[PDB]
Amino acid sequence: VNPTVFFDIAVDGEPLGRVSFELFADKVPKTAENFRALSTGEKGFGYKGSCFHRIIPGFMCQGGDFTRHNGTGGKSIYGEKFEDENFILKHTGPGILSMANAGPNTNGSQFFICTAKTEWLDGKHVVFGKVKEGMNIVEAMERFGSRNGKTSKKITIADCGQLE
């Protein structure tokens, strides 16, 4: 019942590959539905064409700022910044999909993919999904990041949507 979404990633415009996610709608339905919606674009806005603007190897890949392309923007499907739904699920290792924010109850559209166990984020960021297929594509993306998070090539979501 949990929905599956995919990203088709490109690097300076050249295809790299597809990452797919399981979204834990059974446990965090409001947060999973936001990400699902933004990935299909069915509200008229969303992730297609946006970039991963902050990539720190061994740490995480952050994206979803489809409004300002640099970490200052993005918006949810709810007309404002939704609440932290719950912190049931933990940051247990690579592939975890989790919400970025600006403090308690400030979720918008930005998210990150963990490339390592990041327990210090437990209780701070809402985990709502996991990479299903294509972790190797995340690993290839990670190599274009840097110590301060600046990417050496443009990493884009060339296409995205819902699978199955």
Query: DSSP states of 22-68 as a string?
Result: EE-TTT-HHHHHHHHHHHHTTTS-SSTT-BEEEEETTTEEEE--TTT
Q: Which of 46, 49, 38, 40 is nearest to 9 (CA)?
A: 49
β-strand partners of 18? 8
Contacts of 24 (CB under 8 A, 6+ apart): 2, 32, 89, 127, 128, 129, 130
How far apart (Å, rounded) are the C-alpha atoms in residues 43 and 162? 14
Radius of gyration for the alpha carbons in the chain, expressed in angstroms and rounded? 14
Q: Which residues are the active-site residues?
A: 54, 59, 62, 101, 112, 121, 125
Domains and CATH numbers, the chain: 1-164 (2.40.100.10)
Cα separation values, 117 from 21, 23, 30, 122, Å: 17, 19, 24, 10
Buried b / exposed e over 50-62, threshold 16 CB at 10 Å, is bbbbbbbbebbbb
